[PDB]
Amino acid sequence: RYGPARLWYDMLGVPEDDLLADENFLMVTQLHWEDDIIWDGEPWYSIFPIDNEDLVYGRWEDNIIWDAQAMPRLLEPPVLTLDPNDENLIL
Amino acid sequence: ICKHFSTTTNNIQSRITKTFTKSWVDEKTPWTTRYGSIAGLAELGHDVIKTLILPRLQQEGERIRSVLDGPVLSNIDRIGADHVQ
Amino acid sequence: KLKLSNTVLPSESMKVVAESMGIAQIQEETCQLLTDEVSYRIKEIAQDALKFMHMGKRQKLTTSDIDYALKLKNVEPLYGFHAQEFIPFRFASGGGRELYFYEEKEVDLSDIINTPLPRVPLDVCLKAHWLSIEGCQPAIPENPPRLKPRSIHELSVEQQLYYKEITEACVGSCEAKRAEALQSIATDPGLYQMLPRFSTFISEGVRVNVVQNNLALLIYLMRMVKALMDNPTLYLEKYVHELIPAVMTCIVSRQLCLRPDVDNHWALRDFAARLVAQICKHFSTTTNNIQSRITKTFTKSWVDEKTPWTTRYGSIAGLAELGHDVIKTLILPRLQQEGERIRSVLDGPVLSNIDRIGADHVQSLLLKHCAPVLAKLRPPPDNQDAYRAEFGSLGPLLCSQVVKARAQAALQ
Amino acid sequence: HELSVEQQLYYKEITEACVGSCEAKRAEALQSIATDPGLYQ
Amino acid sequence: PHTYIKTPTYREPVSDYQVLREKAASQRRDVERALTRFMAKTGETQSLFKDD
């Protein structure tokens, strides 16, 4: 309740505490890659960066609210997790 | 957000197009959410509306079923339907 | 549930055999008596030829299994003939008769002599490999297949070191290093799940490698693309949206480095790029997305007025290597424009630019394509001055190229 | 892990400027969010 | 041993006191500059120079 989004919590007043075929979606068939063609232009620690595991793996699509009244599951308040994989954060 | 951040490890754009597509092709969806699906799919680009929107252009007939000839005119489906149109 | 039946040979085939032998007027009970006896002997032998299949450790009944199953039942394996005396061939298999249902039933006796004999295959050798290393099966080609936690990269450090070695070998400092790294790309089965980083390294490389036209850097990257394509294990059409604009840029771009001299390689940079471009339109094909898109870009590269001649030559090569019908339907209505461009380069004295070299290469390539396009759809009559109706570009030399093609066809 | 008072005050002012009391403070808060260098953390 | 064995890697950690002091200092200076410019722009303001 007191974390980020406390303003929303206080305003609410809660106080406890065939077109679906895989090819259609391949980005060769969905991207104007012609624009890229350049015409007359003018490891002990990781070598590559580490991607957001939640974006790469998690089903964030399950947080889309398709119908406000008929919501298939019950959502819960989210706690701040302060991922330390991201640089630019002191801790 | 899927032009700046979609990478082949991310699969942001393909997973956004798949949600929009199975929300649009599936019937029982309201005209507001179909409007949102068509709006996102049509803001993605030209090849997306070539290979997603243009097969279901016959759905416009199913739309004009409820526009040119509706038993209930004073409902809220007509403004959303001709906005979709 | 088992509805097993007893299938016998038809009796209406046994009366045909009997009346074609001199035994006429046979009864049906006489004829049914023949087709349950011989259908048992076929069933007795095929059950007995399945013993030799299992003993030889095969799952396919070969033609030699019935030769040993017949010899086991004291019947001669000979099928074409039967020797009453049995002394010339005693239970010796002659390998059956190579006969067909759709055969010609008459051949010329010098057709069998003049055909080349098939190549005797390699003899049996013993190679050893590893199925299991202390419990784990290796991926060698002889084998078939609140703070959030600190995440790990999806590559191992052996895999990341392998990627670093393969990429530092594929920039071609040493040629043997390149060639192995290219073969390693061409047949590593576990090269999936590293393929985003290879595609990104290729794509990003060509775009910052055409800022200064570094031909080797590009020839090595195109060979890396070709080595990525012929690998059978990896799934490529998720990454072809990065691969294709890289090759189009090799073919349709201007050369920032010395214009002449390496233009010979530049033609090959456009030769390797047009090869991999038509190989990419051969694979990965769905309706009206890939091949038609690169065809449209090549044609609007061609019909564009007052092009760079490097871009012109590359696009000409790219449209040229697209197959049989593409030059049959596209290069036809454009000969006059090609001739006019050649005439302009010829008239203007300017020789220190690259326009003249570009013109000569374009004309030679167009003339060779036009030669078979002609050899392919017409007879070789009037090969002297009829080509003067097509502005007289290749003429008798085109006719000589067509004659060389005809000689190659005769050799085939 | 816990924001210092400076950035706690900055977070409070920027979030309460985008709730709808007036439009000009909202436009300056959005022009702050879009054009500041150190808003990580 | 790309074929039978494997091991994980991590991201490069920056445990340097100099660059950590620099990062915390510059982030504190930038957030206090952003806060004071936002509060001076959305209120009554003074200026040492004419129309500044």
Contact A73, E37 (CB under 8 A): no
Residue showing tokens 């190679």: C127
Task: Give the Cα separation of C188 and C170 in Å (integer).
Answer: 15
Residues of A whose CB is below 8 A from C248: 34, 37
Q: How far is C291 from chain E (nearest CA, A)?
A: 37
Residues of A whose CB is below 8 A from E10: 45-46
Locate the chain E residue with the closest alpha carbon to A88: E23
Question: Which spans in C253-290 are helix H?
Answer: 263-282
Q: Report which of C276, C275, C333 is spatially closest to residue C302, judged by C-alpha positions.
A: C333
Q: CA dist D10 to A91, D33, D40, E23, E39, Å? A: 19, 11, 12, 18, 9
Chains B and A touching, counted as 3 or more CB pairs less than 8 Å apart = yes
Q: Does B9 touch chain A (CB under 8 A)?
A: yes
Closest partner CB to D40 (pick from A4, A7, A89): A89
Q: Does D13 touch chain A (CB under 8 A)?
A: no
Closest partner CB to C152 (pick from E1, E4, E8): E8
Closest partner CB to E9 (pick from A43, A87, A90): A43
Closest partner CB to C157 (pick from E4, E7, E11): E7
Amino acid letter, residue B67: V
| CB contact (8 A) between residue E9 and residue A44 | yes
Best E3, E12, E14, E15 member to test C by mutation, with max C CBs in 10 Å, is E3
Q: C160 exposed, middle or buried (CB, 10 Å; 0-12, 13-18, 19+)?
A: buried
Task: Give the Cα separation of C370 and C400 in Å (integer).
Answer: 12
Residue showing tokens 């022009």: D31
Q: What are the φ and ψ backbone dihedral angles of C136, each rounded to 5 degrees?
A: -105, 135
CA atoms within 13 A on the CB side of E9: 19
CA atoms within 13 A on the CB side of C132: 3
Structure tokens that stand for C7 in this block: 């299938």
Resolution in A: 9.0
Amino acid letter, residue A80: L
> Hey, which residues 122-181 in chain C have their CB within 8 Å of chain E?
133, 136-140, 150-153, 155-160, 162
Q: What is the CA radius of gyration of chain E?
A: 23
Residues of E whose CB is below 8 A from A49: 11
Q: CA dist C183 to C74, C202, C211, C223, Å? A: 56, 17, 29, 11
CA C163 from chain centre, in angstroms, equals 29
DSSP-assigned letters across all residues of C144-206: ----PPPP--SS-HHHHHHHHHHHHHTT-SSHHHHHHHHHHHHH-GGGTTSHHHHHHHHHHHH
Locate the chain C residue with the closest alpha carbon to A82: C147
Task: Give the Cα separation of B45 and B53 in Å (integer).
Answer: 11
- Sorted by sequence, the CB contacts under 8 Å of residue C32 that are 6+ apart come out as C11
Locate the chain C residue with the closest alpha carbon to B47: C289
Residue showing tokens 């006719």: C399
Locate the chain A residue with the closest alpha carbon to E7: A44
Q: What is the CA radius of gyration of chain A?
A: 21
Instruction: Pick left, alpha or beta for residue A13 (phi over 0 → left; psi -120 to 50 → alpha; otherwise beta).
Output: left
3-class secondary structure, C8:
coil
Amino acid letter, residue B14: S
Q: Does D8 touch chain A (CB under 8 A)?
A: no
Q: Report which of C239, C347, C352, C252 is spatially closest to residue C299, judged by C-alpha positions.
A: C252
Locate the chain A residue with the closest alpha carbon to D18: A7
Closest partner CB to C139 (pick from E3, E8, E11): E3
Contact C320, C302 (CB under 8 A): no
Task: Give the Cα separation of C348 and A55 in Å (integer).
Answer: 60
Q: What is the CA radius of gyration of chain D?
A: 11
Q: Report which of C159, C273, C217 is spatially closest to residue E5, judged by C-alpha positions.
A: C159
Q: Report which of C176, C181, C281, C167 is spatially closest to residue C231, judged by C-alpha positions.
A: C181
Q: Does A34 touch chain C (CB under 8 A)?
A: yes
Rounded to 5°, angle at Cα C193 from C192 and C198 = 80
Q: Does A63 touch chain B (CB under 8 A)?
A: no
**Torsion of the alpha carbons at E18, E21, E22 and E23, rounded to the nearest 10:** 120
Task: Give the Cα separation of C60 and C44 in Å (integer).
Answer: 18
Q: Does A49 touch chain E (CB under 8 A)?
A: yes
Instruction: Pick left, alpha or beta for residue B6 (phi over 0 → left; psi -120 to 50 → alpha; otherwise beta).
Output: beta
Amino acid letter, residue D36: D
Residue showing tokens 């374009």: C362
Task: Give the Cα separation of C253 and A37 in Å (integer).
Answer: 9
Q: CA dist C129 to C133, C140, C185, C191, E1, Å? A: 11, 9, 21, 21, 15
Query: Chains near B, with 3+ CB pairs < 8 A?
Result: A, C
Amino acid letter, residue C412: Q
Percent composition of chain C: helix, strand, coil (DSSP 3-state, to 5): 55, 0, 45
Contact C11, C35 (CB under 8 A): yes
- Sorted by sequence, the CB contacts under 8 Å of residue C182 that are 6+ apart come out as C170, C223, C224, C227
Q: C67 exposed, middle or buried (CB, 10 Å; 0-12, 13-18, 19+)?
A: buried
Q: CA dist E40 to C167, D8, E30, E44, Å? A: 54, 18, 15, 7
> Hey, which residues 1-20 in chain E have their CB within 8 Å of chain C?
1-11
Closest partner CB to C293 (pick from A34, A43, A47): A34
Q: Report which of D11, A87, E11, D22 is spatially closest to residue C154, judged by C-alpha positions.
A: E11
Task: Give the Cα separation of C30 and A44 in Å (integer).
Answer: 88
Residue showing tokens 């930038």: E30
| DSSP single-letter state for residue C212 | T
| CB contact (8 A) between residue E31 and residue D17 | no
Structure tokens that stand for B25 in this block: 């092709």
Structure tokens that stand for D22 in this block: 């007036």
Q: Does C221 touch chain A (CB under 8 A)?
A: no
What approach was used to elucidate this structure?
cryo-EM
Query: Chains near E, with 3+ CB pairs < 8 A?
Result: A, C, D
Q: How far is B39 from chain C (nearest CA, A)?
A: 23
| CB contact (8 A) between residue A43 and residue C160 | yes
CA atoms within 13 A on the CB side of B59: 18
Query: Chains near D, with 3+ CB pairs < 8 A?
Result: A, E
Task: Give the Cα separation of A51 and A86 in Å (integer).
Answer: 10
Q: C320 exposed, middle or buried (CB, 10 Å; 0-12, 13-18, 19+)?
A: buried
Structure tokens that stand for D15 in this block: 């979030």
3-class secondary structure, C12:
helix
Instruction: Pick left, alpha or beta for residue C379 (phi over 0 → left; psi -120 to 50 → alpha; otherwise beta).
Output: beta
Residue showing tokens 């006896």: C37
Closest partner CB to C146 (pick from A40, A46, A81): A81
**Torsion of the alpha carbons at C293, C297, C298 and C302, rounded to the nearest 10:** 150
| CB contact (8 A) between residue B7 and residue C239 | no
| CB contact (8 A) between residue C153 and residue A85 | no
Task: Give the Cα separation of C394 and A5 in Å (integer).
Answer: 78
Q: Does A89 touch chain D (CB under 8 A)?
A: yes
Q: Does C300 touch chain A (CB under 8 A)?
A: no
| DSSP single-letter state for residue E20 | H
Structure tokens that stand for C388 in this block: 């003067």
Task: Give the Cα separation of C96 and C68 in Å (integer).
Answer: 12
* Topology of the domain covering C11-73: Histone, subunit A (1.10.20)
| DSSP single-letter state for residue C136 | B
Contact C234, C186 (CB under 8 A): no
Q: Does C244 touch chain A (CB under 8 A)?
A: yes
- A vs E: CB pairs below 8 A: 18
Q: CA dist B30 to B34, B37, B56, B84, Å? A: 6, 11, 16, 11
Chains E and B touching, counted as 3 or more CB pairs less than 8 Å apart = no
**Torsion of the alpha carbons at E41, E46, E49 and E52, rounded to the nearest 10:** 20
| CB contact (8 A) between residue A90 and residue E10 | no
Q: Report which of C226, C223, C230, C235 is spatially closest to residue C194, judged by C-alpha positions.
A: C235
Task: Give the Cα separation of C268 and A81 in Å (integer).
Answer: 55
